[PDB]
Amino acid sequence: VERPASVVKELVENSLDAGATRIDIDIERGGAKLIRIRDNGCGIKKDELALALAIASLDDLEAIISLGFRGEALASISSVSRLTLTSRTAEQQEAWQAYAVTVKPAAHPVGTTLEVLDTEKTEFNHIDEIIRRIALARFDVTINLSHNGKIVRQYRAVPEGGQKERRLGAICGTAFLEQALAIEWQHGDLTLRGWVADPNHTTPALAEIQYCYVNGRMMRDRLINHAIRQACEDKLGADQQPAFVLYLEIDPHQVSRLVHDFIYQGVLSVLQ
Amino acid sequence: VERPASVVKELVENSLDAGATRIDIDIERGGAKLIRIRDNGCGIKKDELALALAEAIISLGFRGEALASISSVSRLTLTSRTAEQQEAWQAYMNVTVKPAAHPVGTTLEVLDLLRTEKTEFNHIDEIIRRIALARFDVTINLSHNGKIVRQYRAVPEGGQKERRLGAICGTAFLEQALAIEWQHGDLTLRGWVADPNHTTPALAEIQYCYVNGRMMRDRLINHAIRQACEDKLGADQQPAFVLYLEIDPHQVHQSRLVHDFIYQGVLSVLQ
């Protein structure tokens, strides 16, 4: 939890794993001043809220801190800024809020919110990137990133088999969206979905977009990249960075040659 | 004339008079279901919040009076925080004022308990459009069911008036827009008028005229603008425009000249 962006990632991640479907994250002054994350995911029972900010004390708590993987992370954060946790769970309950050590009731929908008041705008650009990644990683969750009351981006969630182009356009701009060649490949466990910009029309600006996710986790393999490259260099002798946003899926296999051919094949096909 | 749109207008108005600079208004199901207005203008001290839903403190709430009329028609959920570290609060036949999370501003949830479905939203859209043009200095974001509909960004000192105008009236008009700046003493006529020659009946839908901030609708003002265009070319037909008239306090030669001032202003821009 070094940079603010990193913190955004954390809190935002927590929210997602918490079952979030809408994450409205607002930032003020590179996040240094304010950093608020409000999710509609699971909540935190009043009790957990307390220690969530704060080992002899867990003796009594009787392993309730086990219901807080993020809680552990919160402690690391709160000990670096004015943390103001405030959530309310789903089951028969009222909303609560913690400060600092002071857990009192409050108003809040079945969700969670967090205020944070700890190379100025650079920081925001880092957060923007981060959220971009996540956004593409989870097309099923609305995300709204704002700065100093100024709405910056609104990545609406996409329902079942819906308009993927819209959100893709909002995350990567129409520039890419226009050159986007949608691809759907599948060979048993191997699945390759996503887009690849028409090489012939790929500007170095577009080549900035190179996102590849392997089973949800954004990876970065030189092998996967070479495959996509070679595919384009083969369509046309044009050897240069390609623009893409692909999603690879395979059966648990931490890294295989075939995989390369599967991708090379998938992509190459879409081009022709 | 009490429709949801009307309520939007009220709450939105309140926000503006409260010195707002950004008003993100969201609506759900013609507003019947949800109607949320969040402004970044002066807030409301915890105490005022209470009676605002129900001593000489209610004088600090012209809108507060309005709120009472509303809350007594739906599940009102006021929640604001004044320009101070003092955290946010919220009120709910008695008020339940407790703490809450919210930035220096105000928010209001409204759930009613008839008319049409989508028609209602279109009424709100119109309304916000009016206001938008009336206050080029304040960002407004109207959404529906989580779906962002329009974003009218505010314009800085001597900024780009065309941008926002384009977003409120579309490029169709923006393209035919003939900017006009007239002044004869107290009389001032600013705004735009679409090239008649290229005014489609679709464009003629845009006929907004404000007299000193207040959107008026005088047949006299309209006749003036019309005649001006019918004179440029024999083309007699509804004109497209968005004008702003300014004059010294004079509720309506006292008004004849005004006609000529406008006729003159417009006619000139055409030639």
UniProtKB/Swiss-Prot annotation, chain A:
Domain of life according to the entry: Bacteria
What this chain does, per the entry, is described as: This protein is involved in the repair of mismatches in DNA. It is required for dam-dependent methyl-directed DNA mismatch repair. May act as a 'molecular matchmaker', a protein that promotes the formation of a stable complex between two or more DNA-binding proteins in an ATP-dependent manner without itself being part of the final effector complex. The ATPase activity of MutL is stimulated by DNA.
Identify its protein family.
Answer: Belongs to the DNA mismatch repair MutL/HexB family.
Put simply, this protein is called DNA mismatch repair protein MutL
Question: What is the species of this protein?
Answer: Escherichia coli (strain K12)
The gene that this protein is the product of is mutL
**Which part of the full protein is shown?**
20 to 331 of 615
From Swiss-Prot, chain B:
Q: Which organism is it from?
A: Escherichia coli (strain K12)
- Gene encoding this polypeptide? mutL
Question: This protein is called what?
Answer: DNA mismatch repair protein MutL
Q: Cystine bridges: which residues? A: none
Q: Which family does it belong to?
A: Belongs to the DNA mismatch repair MutL/HexB family.
Signal peptide coordinates: none
Q: What does this protein do?
A: This protein is involved in the repair of mismatches in DNA. It is required for dam-dependent methyl-directed DNA mismatch repair. May act as a 'molecular matchmaker', a protein that promotes the formation of a stable complex between two or more DNA-binding proteins in an ATP-dependent manner without itself being part of the final effector complex. The ATPase activity of MutL is stimulated by DNA.
